[PDB]
Amino acid sequence: SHMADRAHSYMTSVIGYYFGKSSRSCWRSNYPYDGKGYWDGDALVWGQGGGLSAFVAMRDATKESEVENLYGAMDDMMFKGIQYFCQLDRGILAYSCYPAAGNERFYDDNVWIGLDMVDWYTETKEMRYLTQAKVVWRYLIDHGWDETCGGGVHWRELNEHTTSKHSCSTGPTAVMGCKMYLATQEQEYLDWAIKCYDYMLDVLQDKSDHLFYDNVRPNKDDPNLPGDLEKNKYSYNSGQPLQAACLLYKITGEQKYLDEAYAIAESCHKKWFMPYRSKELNLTFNILAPGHAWFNTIMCRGFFELYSIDNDRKYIDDIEKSMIHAWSSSCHQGNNLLNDDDLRGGTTKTGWEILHQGALVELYARLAVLERENR
């Protein structure tokens, strides 16, 4: 069992460094912490969601391990803290960026919390998680989605509502609907997931490589049609449609979902991994390239979903080699954390953020699962 060990060792330090340094039983954004942060250093709800993902993912990784009871004992305190960010504001209940109303609120912040909750429900069958997932759902569908830009999900709700439609909110809402459908078999979730996914492919996809642009703004002549695109490609905006395509294949059985998945996967793999020789592993592979670790972890969800369908382990092999390399090299700091800017090792950091550390902890947690299944 090596993969279980790296994951528990790492998450232990993370909890130790970042968790419950406030009265709100939650994650602090940074380590070391300069005392200089709003809300006693509590991470924004985006950072919270990265910590939560690492935990929910660790609850999956640790089932049938020695430490299962240990992580299960931590449910109430993880739950208590993320609920402080759950705020009625302007008569809409959704997760604010800080634990009070009168704060900024975003749809994409929320969907990442929906995703955590639904899967947390999946691991536990405790209703309260599915209840919070439904909260996020309604907000996404009743407020996030509208017919401007030809459809699709908004970005910022408060304080000033934006008008552009984003991959970062629309793609993972497709993923969330699929998981909500799998959790409940209510048709509502599958219909909306397909609408979100079709929106992605129809407005926000580059057909040259099947990768996904960032956002679209309303058409000047007619705001119900799509207008100008921002064509920045970030890994997470492609891995989520990758994940949604796989989930829709598993649910519907239609081959088009899986053909699309293969194509987005090939391109995600050519773009966001790079050839690398590891001295410590004595291997050439493609390493996850220097970048934003949390974007990339969220991208990798799509790969783990796909592997579950076709049993072709060629992408997971690279992700696995990436994280074994990072652990065993100068990426791994003496304080037990990882320099998430560059998994090849060889950069210098003096501050590490929960968003990215939870991101890399989730990747070890998923590798730990595959090791349990001896996959």
Side-chain angles (χ1 to χ4, degrees), residues 1 4-35 37-375:
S1 104
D5 289 339
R6 303 177 185 96
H8 172 235
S9 161
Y10 192 9
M11 181 60 158
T12 293
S13 317
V14 170
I15 281 158
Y17 296 135
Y18 297 82
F19 196 81
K21 316 293 193 207
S22 179
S23 60
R24 289 160 294 252
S25 190
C26 65
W27 302 105
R28 195 197 260 160
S29 73
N30 252 105
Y31 177 82
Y33 170 54
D34 51 15
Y38 286 148
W39 287 92
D40 317 300
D42 286 337
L44 292 149
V45 76
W46 187 29
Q48 301 306 324
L52 185 59
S53 286
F55 182 75
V56 181
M58 288 291 286
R59 281 291 263 118
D60 183 2
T62 50
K63 292 287 188 67
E64 310 178 7
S65 81
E66 294 304 340
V67 299
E68 174 183 353
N69 278 187
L70 283 172
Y71 287 95
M74 274 175 283
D75 279 348
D76 281 350
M77 77 177 203
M78 300 290 324
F79 189 63
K80 198 211 257 281
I82 189 56
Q83 292 299 99
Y84 285 113
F85 292 75
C86 198
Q87 292 295 329
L88 192 69
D89 199 345
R90 257 90 145 189
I92 294 148
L93 179 73
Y95 290 75
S96 300
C97 75
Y98 277 127
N103 279 290
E104 290 205 304
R105 201 154 63 183
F106 308 77
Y107 294 103
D108 63 344
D109 279 355
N110 274 262
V111 68
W112 302 123
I113 299 286
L115 286 160
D116 292 337
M117 291 289 180
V118 61
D119 277 13
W120 206 349
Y121 170 68
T122 279
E123 287 307 314
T124 61
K125 304 185 285 172
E126 287 276 329
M127 268 300 203
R128 52 183 207 180
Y129 304 136
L130 169 70
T131 300
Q132 298 315 118
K134 291 185 197 153
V135 167
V136 169
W137 181 258
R138 305 269 42 108
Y139 172 64
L140 290 172
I141 302 312
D142 300 347
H143 292 96
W145 179 280
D146 65 28
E147 291 303 318
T148 63
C149 301
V153 186
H154 285 284
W155 170 52
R156 194 179 61 217
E157 175 215 353
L158 314 168
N159 270 107
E160 328 227 285
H161 214 286
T162 56
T163 57
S164 45
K165 294 311 185 62
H166 285 60
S167 298
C168 61
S169 60
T170 311
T173 296
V175 177
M176 193 181 167
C178 292
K179 294 159 160 290
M180 285 306 263
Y181 184 81
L182 290 162
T184 68
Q185 297 106 335
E186 292 175 57
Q187 181 72 22
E188 83 156 305
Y189 302 108
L190 175 59
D191 292 337
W192 282 102
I194 289 164
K195 296 165 79 33
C196 286
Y197 177 86
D198 291 354
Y199 188 80
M200 291 301 288
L201 270 50
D202 278 346
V203 187
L204 283 163
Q205 200 185 45
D206 191 342
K207 297 303 191 192
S208 172
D209 62 7
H210 287 81
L211 299 190
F212 299 75
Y213 306 129
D214 194 75
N215 68 78
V216 60
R217 287 173 187 196
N219 179 289
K220 49 160 291 161
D221 293 354
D222 180 346
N224 284 349
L225 306 164
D228 291 339
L229 285 161
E230 178 192 332
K231 298 192 172 265
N232 269 303
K233 294 180 181 165
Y234 305 109
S235 57
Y236 76 128
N237 284 338
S238 292
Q240 289 299 102
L242 177 53
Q243 198 179 2
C246 300
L247 278 174
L248 286 158
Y249 173 71
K250 294 178 163 167
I251 289 165
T252 68
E254 309 177 37
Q255 190 65 35
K256 59 174 175 152
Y257 292 109
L258 175 60
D259 289 353
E260 185 64 36
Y262 295 137
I264 306 172
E266 284 293 347
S267 302
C268 287
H269 191 49
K270 298 153 173 222
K271 190 170 169 85
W272 285 291
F273 293 63
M274 63 178 280
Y276 183 67
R277 166 170 191 70
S278 182
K279 176 195 88 246
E280 292 90 344
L281 287 53
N282 200 42
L283 288 167
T284 326
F285 59 97
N286 320 104
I287 196 155
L288 280 154
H292 197 273
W294 179 89
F295 286 174
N296 277 179
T297 284
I298 293 298
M299 175 200 56
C300 294
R301 297 190 181 169
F303 291 114
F304 283 114
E305 209 68 63
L306 174 68
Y307 181 46
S308 77
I309 287 154
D310 78 347
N311 303 293
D312 183 326
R313 186 166 173 148
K314 70 173 193 189
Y315 309 114
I316 299 307
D317 280 340
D318 281 343
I319 301 158
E320 187 161 69
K321 293 173 193 156
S322 295
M323 301 322 108
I324 300 172
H325 175 83
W327 194 246
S328 91
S329 79
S330 52
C331 189
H332 205 164
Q333 308 298 89
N335 62 16
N336 212 27
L337 306 186
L338 277 63
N339 281 8
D340 50 79
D341 61 345
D342 192 333
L343 289 176
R344 292 176 305 185
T347 70
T348 314
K349 284 186 68 93
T350 56
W352 302 260
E353 308 191 85
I354 199 42
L355 175 65
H356 292 310
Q357 301 306 124
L360 300 187
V361 167
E362 170 180 343
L363 288 188
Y364 292 97
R366 313 222 130 98
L367 295 172
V369 179
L370 292 196
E371 178 196 63
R372 173 175 71 241
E373 310 175 353
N374 277 111
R375 268 166 79 67

